[PDB]
Every structure is written in structure tokens, then in C-alpha cells.
Coordinates of C-alpha atoms and ligand atoms in Angstrom, one line a residue:
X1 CA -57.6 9.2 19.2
X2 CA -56.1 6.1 18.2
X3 CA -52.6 5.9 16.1
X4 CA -52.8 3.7 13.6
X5 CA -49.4 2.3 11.5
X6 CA -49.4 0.1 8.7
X7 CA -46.4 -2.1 7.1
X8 CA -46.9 -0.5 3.8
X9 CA -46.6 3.1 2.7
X10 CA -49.3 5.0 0.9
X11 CA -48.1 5.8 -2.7
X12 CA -45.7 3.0 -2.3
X13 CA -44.8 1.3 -5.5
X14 CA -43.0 -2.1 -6.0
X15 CA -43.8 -3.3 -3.0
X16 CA -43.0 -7.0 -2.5
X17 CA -45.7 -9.9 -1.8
X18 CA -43.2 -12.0 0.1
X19 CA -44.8 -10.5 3.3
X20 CA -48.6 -10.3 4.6
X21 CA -49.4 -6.7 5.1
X22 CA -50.4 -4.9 8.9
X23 CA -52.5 -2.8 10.2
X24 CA -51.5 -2.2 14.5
X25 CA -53.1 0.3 16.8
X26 CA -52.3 2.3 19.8
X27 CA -54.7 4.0 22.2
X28 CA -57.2 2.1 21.4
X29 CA -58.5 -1.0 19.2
X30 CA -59.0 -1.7 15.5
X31 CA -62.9 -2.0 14.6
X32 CA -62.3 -3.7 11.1
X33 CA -59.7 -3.5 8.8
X34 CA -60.4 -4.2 4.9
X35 CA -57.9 -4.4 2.0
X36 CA -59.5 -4.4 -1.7
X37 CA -57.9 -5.0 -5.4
X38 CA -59.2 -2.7 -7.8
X39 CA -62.0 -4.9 -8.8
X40 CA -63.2 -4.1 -5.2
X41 CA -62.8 -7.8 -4.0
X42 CA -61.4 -8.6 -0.6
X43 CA -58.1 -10.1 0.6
X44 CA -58.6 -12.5 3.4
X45 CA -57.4 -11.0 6.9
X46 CA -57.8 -11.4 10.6
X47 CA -57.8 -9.4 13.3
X48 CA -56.2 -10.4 16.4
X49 CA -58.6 -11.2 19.4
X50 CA -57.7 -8.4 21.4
X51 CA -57.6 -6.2 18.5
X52 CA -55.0 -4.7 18.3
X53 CA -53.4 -6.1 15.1
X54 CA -54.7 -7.2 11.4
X55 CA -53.4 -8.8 8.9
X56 CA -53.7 -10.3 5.6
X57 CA -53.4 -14.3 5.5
X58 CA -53.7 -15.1 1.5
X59 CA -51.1 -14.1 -0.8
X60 CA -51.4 -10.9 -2.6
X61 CA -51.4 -10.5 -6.1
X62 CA -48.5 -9.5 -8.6
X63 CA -49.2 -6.3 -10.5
X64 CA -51.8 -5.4 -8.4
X65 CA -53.5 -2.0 -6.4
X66 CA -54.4 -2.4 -3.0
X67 CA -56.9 -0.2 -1.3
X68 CA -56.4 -0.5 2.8
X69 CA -59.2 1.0 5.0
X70 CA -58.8 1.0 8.7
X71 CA -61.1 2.0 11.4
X72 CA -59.7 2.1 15.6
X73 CA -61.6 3.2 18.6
X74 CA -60.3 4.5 21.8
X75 CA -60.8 6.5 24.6
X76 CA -60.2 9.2 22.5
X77 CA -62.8 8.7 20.1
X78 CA -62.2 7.0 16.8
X79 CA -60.0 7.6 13.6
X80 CA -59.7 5.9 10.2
X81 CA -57.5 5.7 7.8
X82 CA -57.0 5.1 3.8
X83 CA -53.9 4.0 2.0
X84 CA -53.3 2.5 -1.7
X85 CA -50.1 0.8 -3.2
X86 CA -48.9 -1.3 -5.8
X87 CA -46.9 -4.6 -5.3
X88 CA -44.0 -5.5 -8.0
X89 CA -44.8 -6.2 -11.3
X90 CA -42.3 -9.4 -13.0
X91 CA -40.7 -9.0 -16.2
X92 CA -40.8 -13.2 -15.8
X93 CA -41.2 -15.8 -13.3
X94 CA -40.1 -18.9 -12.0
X95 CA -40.9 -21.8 -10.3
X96 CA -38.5 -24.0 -8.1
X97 CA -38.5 -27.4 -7.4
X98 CA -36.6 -29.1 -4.5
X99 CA -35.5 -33.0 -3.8
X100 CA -35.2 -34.2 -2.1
X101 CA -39.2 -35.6 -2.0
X102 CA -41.2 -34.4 1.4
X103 CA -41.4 -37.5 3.7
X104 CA -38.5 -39.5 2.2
X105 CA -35.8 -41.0 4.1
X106 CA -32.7 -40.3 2.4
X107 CA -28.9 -41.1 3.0
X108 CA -26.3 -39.2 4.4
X109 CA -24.4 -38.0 1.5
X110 CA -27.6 -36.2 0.1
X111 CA -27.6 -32.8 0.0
X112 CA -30.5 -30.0 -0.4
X113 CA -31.2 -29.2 -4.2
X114 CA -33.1 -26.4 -5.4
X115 CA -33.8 -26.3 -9.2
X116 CA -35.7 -23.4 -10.6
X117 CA -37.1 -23.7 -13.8
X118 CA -35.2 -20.4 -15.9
X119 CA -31.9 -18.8 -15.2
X120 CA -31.4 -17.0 -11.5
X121 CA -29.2 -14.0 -12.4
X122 CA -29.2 -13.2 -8.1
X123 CA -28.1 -15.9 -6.8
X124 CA -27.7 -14.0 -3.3
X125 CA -31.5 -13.5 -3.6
X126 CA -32.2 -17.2 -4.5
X127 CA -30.0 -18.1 -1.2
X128 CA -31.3 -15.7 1.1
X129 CA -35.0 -16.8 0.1
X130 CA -34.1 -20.4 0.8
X131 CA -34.5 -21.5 4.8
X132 CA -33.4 -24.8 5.5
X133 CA -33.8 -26.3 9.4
X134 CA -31.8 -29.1 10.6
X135 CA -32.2 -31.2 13.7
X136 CA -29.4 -32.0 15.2
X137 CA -28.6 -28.7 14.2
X138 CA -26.0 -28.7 12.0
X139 CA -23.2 -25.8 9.7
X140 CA -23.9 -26.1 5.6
X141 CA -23.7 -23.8 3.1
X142 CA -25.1 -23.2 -0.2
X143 CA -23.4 -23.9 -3.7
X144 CA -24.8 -23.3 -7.5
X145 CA -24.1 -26.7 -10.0
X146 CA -25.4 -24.6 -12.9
X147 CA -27.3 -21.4 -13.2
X148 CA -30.5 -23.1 -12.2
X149 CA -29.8 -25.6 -9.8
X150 CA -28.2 -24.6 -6.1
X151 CA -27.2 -27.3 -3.3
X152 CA -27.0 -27.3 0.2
X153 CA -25.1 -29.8 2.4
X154 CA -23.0 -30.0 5.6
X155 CA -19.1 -29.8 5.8
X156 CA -19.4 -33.5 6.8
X157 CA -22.3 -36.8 6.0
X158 CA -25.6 -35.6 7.8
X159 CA -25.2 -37.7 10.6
X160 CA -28.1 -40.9 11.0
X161 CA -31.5 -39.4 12.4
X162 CA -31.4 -36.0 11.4
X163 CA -34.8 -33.8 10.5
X164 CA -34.2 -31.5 7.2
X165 CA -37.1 -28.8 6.9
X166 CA -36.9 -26.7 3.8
X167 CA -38.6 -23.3 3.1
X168 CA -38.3 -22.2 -0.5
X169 CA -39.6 -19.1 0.0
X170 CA -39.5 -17.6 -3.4
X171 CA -42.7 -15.4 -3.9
X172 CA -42.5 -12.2 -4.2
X173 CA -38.8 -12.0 -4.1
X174 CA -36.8 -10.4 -6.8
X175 CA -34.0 -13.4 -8.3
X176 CA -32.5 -10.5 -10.6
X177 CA -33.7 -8.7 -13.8
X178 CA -37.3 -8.5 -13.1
X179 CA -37.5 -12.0 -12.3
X180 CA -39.4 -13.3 -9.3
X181 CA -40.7 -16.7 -7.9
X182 CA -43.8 -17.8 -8.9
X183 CA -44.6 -19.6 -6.0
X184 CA -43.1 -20.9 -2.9
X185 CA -42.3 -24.4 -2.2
X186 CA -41.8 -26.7 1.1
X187 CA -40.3 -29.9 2.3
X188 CA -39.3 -32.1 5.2
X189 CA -36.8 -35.0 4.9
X190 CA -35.0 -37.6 7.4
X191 CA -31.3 -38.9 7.3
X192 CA -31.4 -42.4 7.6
X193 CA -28.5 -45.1 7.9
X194 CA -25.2 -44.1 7.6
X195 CA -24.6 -46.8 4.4
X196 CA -21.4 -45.9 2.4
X197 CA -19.8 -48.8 -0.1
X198 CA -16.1 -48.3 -0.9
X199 CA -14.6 -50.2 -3.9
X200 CA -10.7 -50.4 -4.0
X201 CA -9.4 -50.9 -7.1
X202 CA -6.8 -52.6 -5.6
X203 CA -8.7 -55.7 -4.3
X204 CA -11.6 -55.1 -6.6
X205 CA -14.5 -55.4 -4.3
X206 CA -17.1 -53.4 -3.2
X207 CA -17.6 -53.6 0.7
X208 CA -21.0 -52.0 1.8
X209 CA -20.8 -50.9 5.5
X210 CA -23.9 -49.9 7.5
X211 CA -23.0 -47.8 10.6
X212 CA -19.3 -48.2 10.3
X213 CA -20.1 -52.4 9.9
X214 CA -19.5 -54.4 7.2
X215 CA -22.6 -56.3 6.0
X216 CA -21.7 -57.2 2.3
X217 CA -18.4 -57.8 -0.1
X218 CA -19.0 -57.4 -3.5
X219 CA -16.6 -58.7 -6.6
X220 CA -16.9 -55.9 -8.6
X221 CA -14.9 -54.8 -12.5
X222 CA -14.9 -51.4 -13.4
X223 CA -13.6 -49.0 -16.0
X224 CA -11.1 -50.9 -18.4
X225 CA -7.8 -48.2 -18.3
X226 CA -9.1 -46.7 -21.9
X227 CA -12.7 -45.9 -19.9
X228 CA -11.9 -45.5 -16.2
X229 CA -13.7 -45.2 -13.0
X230 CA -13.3 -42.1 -11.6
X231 CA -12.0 -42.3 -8.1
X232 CA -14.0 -39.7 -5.6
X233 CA -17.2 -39.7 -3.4
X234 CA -20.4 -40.7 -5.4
X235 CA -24.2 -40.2 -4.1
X236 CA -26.7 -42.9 -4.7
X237 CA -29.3 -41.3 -7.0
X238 CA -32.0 -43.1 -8.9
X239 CA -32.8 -47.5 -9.0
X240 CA -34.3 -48.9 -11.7
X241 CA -35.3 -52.4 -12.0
X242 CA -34.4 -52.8 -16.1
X243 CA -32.8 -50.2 -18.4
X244 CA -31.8 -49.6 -21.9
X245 CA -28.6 -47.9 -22.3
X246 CA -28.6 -47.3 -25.9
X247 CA -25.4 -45.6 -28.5
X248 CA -27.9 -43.9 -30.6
X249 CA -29.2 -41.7 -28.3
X250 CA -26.1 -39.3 -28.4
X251 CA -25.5 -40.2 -32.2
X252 CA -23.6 -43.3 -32.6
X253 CA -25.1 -45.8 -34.4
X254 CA -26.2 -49.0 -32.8
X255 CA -25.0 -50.7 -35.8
X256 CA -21.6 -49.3 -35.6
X257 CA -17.9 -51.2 -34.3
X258 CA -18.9 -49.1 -31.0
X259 CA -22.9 -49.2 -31.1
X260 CA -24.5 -51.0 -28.6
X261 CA -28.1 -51.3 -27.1
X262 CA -27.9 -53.1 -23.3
X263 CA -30.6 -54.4 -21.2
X264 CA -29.3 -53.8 -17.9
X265 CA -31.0 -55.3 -15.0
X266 CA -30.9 -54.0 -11.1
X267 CA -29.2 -50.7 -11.7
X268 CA -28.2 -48.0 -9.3
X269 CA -27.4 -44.8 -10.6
X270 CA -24.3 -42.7 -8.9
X271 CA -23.6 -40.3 -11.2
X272 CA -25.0 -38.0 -13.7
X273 CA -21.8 -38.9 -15.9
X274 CA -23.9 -42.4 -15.9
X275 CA -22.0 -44.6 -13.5
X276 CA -24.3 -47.4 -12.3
X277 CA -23.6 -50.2 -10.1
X278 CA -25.8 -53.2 -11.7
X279 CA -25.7 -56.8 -13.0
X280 CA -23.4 -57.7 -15.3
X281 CA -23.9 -61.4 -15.5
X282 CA -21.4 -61.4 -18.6
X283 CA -18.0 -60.5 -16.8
X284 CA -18.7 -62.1 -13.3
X285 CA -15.3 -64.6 -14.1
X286 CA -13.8 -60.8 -14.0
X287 CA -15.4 -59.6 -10.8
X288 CA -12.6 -59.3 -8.5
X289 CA -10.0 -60.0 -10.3
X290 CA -9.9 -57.8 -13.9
X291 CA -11.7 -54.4 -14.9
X292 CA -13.8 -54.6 -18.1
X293 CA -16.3 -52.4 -18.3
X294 CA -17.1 -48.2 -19.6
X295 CA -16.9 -47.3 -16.0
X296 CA -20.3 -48.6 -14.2
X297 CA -19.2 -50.8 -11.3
X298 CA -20.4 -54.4 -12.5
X299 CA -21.2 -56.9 -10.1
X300 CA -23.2 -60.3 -10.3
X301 CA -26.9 -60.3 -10.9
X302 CA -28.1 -61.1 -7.3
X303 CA -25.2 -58.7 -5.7
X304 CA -27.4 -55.7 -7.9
X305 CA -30.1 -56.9 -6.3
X306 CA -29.1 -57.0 -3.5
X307 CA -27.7 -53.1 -4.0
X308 CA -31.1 -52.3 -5.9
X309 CA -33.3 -53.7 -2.5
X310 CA -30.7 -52.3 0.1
X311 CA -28.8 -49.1 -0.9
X312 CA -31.7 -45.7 -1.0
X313 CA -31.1 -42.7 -2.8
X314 CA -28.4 -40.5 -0.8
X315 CA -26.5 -43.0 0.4
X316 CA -22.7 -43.2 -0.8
X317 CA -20.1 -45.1 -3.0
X318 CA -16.7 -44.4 -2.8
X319 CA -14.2 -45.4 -5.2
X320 CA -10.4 -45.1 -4.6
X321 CA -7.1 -46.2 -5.9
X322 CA -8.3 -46.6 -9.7
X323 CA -6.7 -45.2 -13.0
X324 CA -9.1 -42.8 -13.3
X325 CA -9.0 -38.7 -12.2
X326 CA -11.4 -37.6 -10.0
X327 CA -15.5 -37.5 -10.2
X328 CA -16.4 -33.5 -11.1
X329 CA -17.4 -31.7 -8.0
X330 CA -20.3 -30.4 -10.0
X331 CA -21.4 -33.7 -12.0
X332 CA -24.3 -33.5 -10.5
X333 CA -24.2 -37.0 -7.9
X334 CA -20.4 -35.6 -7.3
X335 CA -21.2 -32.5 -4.7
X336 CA -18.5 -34.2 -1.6
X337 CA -15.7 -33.7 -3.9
X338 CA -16.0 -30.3 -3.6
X339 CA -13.4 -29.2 -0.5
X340 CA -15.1 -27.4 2.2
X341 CA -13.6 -24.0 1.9
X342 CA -14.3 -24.1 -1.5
X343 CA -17.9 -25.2 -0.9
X344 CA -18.6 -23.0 1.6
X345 CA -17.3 -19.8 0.2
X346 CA -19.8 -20.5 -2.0
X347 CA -20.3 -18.7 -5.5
X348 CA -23.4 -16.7 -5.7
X349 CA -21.5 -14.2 -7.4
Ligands
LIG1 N1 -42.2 4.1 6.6 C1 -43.1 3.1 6.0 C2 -43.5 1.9 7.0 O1 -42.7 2.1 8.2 C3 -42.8 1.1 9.3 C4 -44.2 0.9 9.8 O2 -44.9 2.2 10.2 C5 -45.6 3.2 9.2 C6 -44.7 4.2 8.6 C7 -46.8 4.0 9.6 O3 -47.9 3.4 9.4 N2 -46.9 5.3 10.2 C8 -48.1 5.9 10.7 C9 -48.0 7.2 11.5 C10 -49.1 6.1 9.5 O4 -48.5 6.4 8.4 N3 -50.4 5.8 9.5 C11 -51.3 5.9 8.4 C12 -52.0 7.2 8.7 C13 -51.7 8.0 7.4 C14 -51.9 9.4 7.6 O5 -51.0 10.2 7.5 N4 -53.1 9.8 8.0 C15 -53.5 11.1 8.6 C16 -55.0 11.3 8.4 C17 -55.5 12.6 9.1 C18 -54.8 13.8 8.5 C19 -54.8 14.0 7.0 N5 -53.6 13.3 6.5 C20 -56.0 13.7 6.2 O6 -56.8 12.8 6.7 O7 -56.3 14.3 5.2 C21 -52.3 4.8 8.2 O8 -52.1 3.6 8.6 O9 -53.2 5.1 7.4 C22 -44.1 -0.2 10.9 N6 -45.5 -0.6 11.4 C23 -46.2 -1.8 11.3 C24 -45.7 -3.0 10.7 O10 -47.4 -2.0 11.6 C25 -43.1 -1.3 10.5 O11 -41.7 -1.2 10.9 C26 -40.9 -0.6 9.9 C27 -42.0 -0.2 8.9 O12 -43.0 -1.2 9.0 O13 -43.3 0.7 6.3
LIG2 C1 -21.2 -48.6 -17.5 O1 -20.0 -48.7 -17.5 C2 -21.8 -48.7 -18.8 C3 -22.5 -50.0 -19.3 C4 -22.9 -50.1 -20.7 O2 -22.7 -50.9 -18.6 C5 -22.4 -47.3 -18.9 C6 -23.8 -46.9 -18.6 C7 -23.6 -45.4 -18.8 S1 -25.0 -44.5 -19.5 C8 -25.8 -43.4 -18.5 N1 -25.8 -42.1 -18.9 C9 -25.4 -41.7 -20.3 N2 -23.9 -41.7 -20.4 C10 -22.4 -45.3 -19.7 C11 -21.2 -44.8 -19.1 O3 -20.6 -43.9 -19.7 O4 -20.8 -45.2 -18.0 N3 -22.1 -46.7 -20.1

């Protein structure tokens, strides 16, 4: 009669719903193949046109009995079978989020972020979970910012005209203590142009080179000595048209000897430390020449223009030979600064 396996065990507890669930047999052909909650209500399946394999297509529950019956004919006469099991039950759950956005076309200093929305206390789990396809294909590794947030980038800039598929496939998978995803998550992004601005301290412009080419000098003044510009490799995050930067946000009064409340026009965001390039139409008889600001790269109104229409998230600015240290690996827009070995090795644990 016909033998018939299944990819779950009857009795089984804790079994996880990152997988459908199977029903195959052998010496002969399934008839129909059901799979019920305890309420009696059925999971969606299909069985293969030659019949010889089921399985479910919708994602099965957390917390939940399952009920499998099976029915196969052969040439031996028929058999069916019954099996229940249980899938995990969470102590919590989250849900992750991913940039960058499906569809977008990005530069080629931006790197894969994962953010999940509570603490991941198995970060190997999170990793494993997460499959990223490149083509070109091309060597990255994983690397945790904080305890919610893990990146993914190459040992080099993606290189112009490369296809980034991500699969967060978090459901059903255990991230440590209890915790599991709520749901899995997917997107597809596109390296663009290879755009990456360098600003030299020591001339005081910012050159913006597309493919290797120059195709803009800016005059640019940075971080006075007291507030430097942090040398190091920056990626181009958020543009906003207009801005408020404002003292009282943290606690210092606006109405202080160091309160302020700018409008800032054409701004470009590089790091999470709040480095813009934008328009700084007060100190363009310093451009080039004298460094006068808290550390944002200020350059005339219609060169932040210019660098708001031109420059797209993931491109990157490059700063070199000022008084500053160096931008933190994990600022956030500072990921590059991290040395390959470092990066790679990774620190999941
Ligand atoms: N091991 C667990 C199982 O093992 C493997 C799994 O194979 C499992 C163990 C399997 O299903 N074994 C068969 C022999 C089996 O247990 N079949 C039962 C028959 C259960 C039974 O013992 N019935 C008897 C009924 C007749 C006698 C008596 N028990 C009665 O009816 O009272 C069924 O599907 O209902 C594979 N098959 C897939 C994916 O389709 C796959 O590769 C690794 C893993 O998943 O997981
Ligand atoms: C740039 O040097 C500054 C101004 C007033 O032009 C700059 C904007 C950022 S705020 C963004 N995030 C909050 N820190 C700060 C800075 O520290 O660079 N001031």
C-alpha cells in the first residue's frame, strides 16, 4: 500500500512556522490531503498535479494544533493516515523593518539595514533568517549598530548597476528568549552612480565626482577647531528642502549665550551625529578659505541646491585632513569606517 511521510512528527511540539508543511507518497498517489486548526477550519494547500506531493501555501498559525489527514492510493490498495502537532508558542514578537525602500535606486556606499522593533538577544538567529541576493554577485557580511539594528554591506562600494534582493525571513524563527518574528519582510534595490564628494580640509572644497569625473567644486567651511568635522567616510542619508535645527530640543535654551533656532535651507543629511551639507548664505566670504561652522559642511545656497537635486541617499562624502578624529563606525551614516576584518568578523555574539 502506499507509504506516506510527512515533514512534521505526530506529537511534535514547538514546531516552527518558518516552513510550509508536506505530505509525499510512494507506491502510489495522494487522494486529498487536509490540515485543520482546532476550530476545524482549513489551511490552504495544494497537491502537486501528479500527485505525489501536498503542501500547505498560507502561513500557519502561532500557538496553534494542527490536525493532518492524508489519504494515497496505489496498486496496493489505499492507506491513510492522521497526525496532530503544535507549532511554537512566543513569549513576544517582533517586527522588522528594512531600508533601504523596495524599488529605490540608492548609492554605492549604502548598506542593507535591518531594524526590528525590540531587542534580538540571537543575533546568529536574526542573521541566519536574513537572505540578501546580489547581482553582480558580490562578498558582505553582516554587522549589529545596536541591539536592534544589523547592516549588511560589501568589503568595497557596491559597484554602479548592481540588483540587491532582500528576504527578511523572520516568521516563525526563534531571535532568543521566546522571541520570534512577527512577520517576514521583502525588498529589492538598485546601486546607481558611483557619486562620492571628498572635501580636503586643506583646500577647503568639496569636489563631487560621478564615475571617477569631476562634475562640481564646491567652497565649503566646516567645523571651527572647538567643533570639528570628523574626518572619515560618510553616507548620504535623508534631503530636506527647509529645516529647523533648534537648542531647545536637547535642553539648552534658545535664549541662552549658546541657544539658537536656524532655518536651514537645502540640507543633506550624512550623519546621525547631524552633519549636513546645506546653504549657509551667512559664511560664503569663508567658503574656501576659513572653517566656521558646528561641523555641517556649509556651502553657498545654490551649491545646496545643487547637492539637494543631485546627490540620492547612499551616495558618499568623504572628508579628510581636518582637525577632527574620525566619524564612529557605528554612528549610524558611518558603517565604511569600520575595517573589513573587523566588519566581517562580525559580532553576533
Ligand atoms: N522524523 C520526523 C520527520 O522526518 C523526516 C520526514 O519523514 C517522516 C519521519 C515520516 O513521515 N515517516 C513516515 C514513515 C511516517 O511517519 N508516516 C506517517 C505514518 C504514521 C504512522 O506511523 N502510521 C501507521 C498507521 C498504521 C499502523 C498503526 N500505527 C495504526 O494505524 O494504529 C504519516 O504521514 O501519517 C521527511 N519527509 C517529508 C518532508 O515529506 C523530511 O526529511 C527529514 C524529515 O522531514 O520530520
Ligand atoms: C552644522 O554644523 C550645524 C548647523 C547649525 O548648521 C549643525 C546641525 C546639526 S543638528 C542635527 N542633529 C542633532 N545634533 C548640529 C551639529 O551638531 O552638527 N548643528
Amino acid at each position: 500500500v502506499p507509504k506516506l511521510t510527512a515533514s512534521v512528527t505526530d506529537g511534535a511540539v514547538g514546531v516552527t512556522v518558518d516552513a510550509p508543511v508536506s505530505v509525499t507518497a510512494a507506491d502510489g498517489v495522494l487522494a486529498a490531503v487536509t490540515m485543520v486548526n482546532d476550530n476545524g477550519r482549513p489551511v490552504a494547500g495544494r497537491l502537486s498535479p501528479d500527485g505525489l506531493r501536498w503542501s500547505t501555501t498560507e502561513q500557519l498559525g502561532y500557538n496553534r494544533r494542527y490536525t493532518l489527514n492524508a489519504t494515497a492510493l496505489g496498486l496496493g490498495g489505499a492507506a491513510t493516515r492522521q497526525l496532530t502537532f503544535q507549532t511554537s508558542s512566543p513569549a513576544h514578537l517582533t517586527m522588522p523593518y528594512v531600508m533601504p525602500g523596495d524599488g529605490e535606486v540608492v548609492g554605492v556606499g549604502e548598506p542593507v539595514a535591518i531594524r526590528f522593533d525590540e531587542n534580538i538577544a540571537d543575533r546568529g538567529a536574526a542573521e541566519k533568517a536574513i537572505k540578501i541576493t546580489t547581482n553582480p554577485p558580490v562578498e558582505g557580511a553582516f554587522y549589529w549598530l545596536n541591539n536592534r539594528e544589523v547592516r549588511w554591506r560589501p568589503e568595497h562600494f557596491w559597484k554602479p548597476g548592481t540588483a540587491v534582493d532582500v528576504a527578511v525571513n523572520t516568521y516563525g524563527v526563534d531571535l532568543g528568549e521566546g522571541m520570534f518574528g512577527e512577520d517576514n519582510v521583502q525588498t529589492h534595490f538598485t546601486i546607481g552612480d558611483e557619486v562620492i564628494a571628498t572635501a580636503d580640509d586643506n583646500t577647503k572644497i568639496l569636489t563631487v565626482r560621478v564615475n571617477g569625473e569631476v562634475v562640481k567644486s564646491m567652497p565649503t567651511s566646516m567645523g571651527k577647531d572647538s567643533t570639528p568635522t570628523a574626518n572619515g567616510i560618510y553616507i548620504v542619508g535623508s534631503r530636506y528642502k527647509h529645516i529647523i535645527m533648534d537648542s531647545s530640543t536637547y535642553g539648552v535654551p534658545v535664549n541662552s549665550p549658546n541657544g539658537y533656532r536656524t532655518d536651514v535651507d537645502w540640507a543633506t543629511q550624512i550623519s546621525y551625529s547631524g552633519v549636513f551639507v546645506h546653504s549657509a548664505p551667512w559664511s560664503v566670504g569663508a567658503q574656501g578659505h576659513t572653517n566656521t561652522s558646528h561641523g555641517c559642511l556649509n556651502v553657498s545656497p545654490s551649491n545646496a541646491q545643487w547637492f539637494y537635486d543631485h546627490v540620492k541617499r547612499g551616495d558618499i562624502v568623504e572628508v579628510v585632513n581636518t582637525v577632527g578624529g574620525t566619524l564612529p563606525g557605528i554612528d549610524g551614516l558611518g558603517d565604511w569606517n569600520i575595517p573589513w576584518d573587523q566588519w566581517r568578523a562580525g559580532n553576533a555574539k
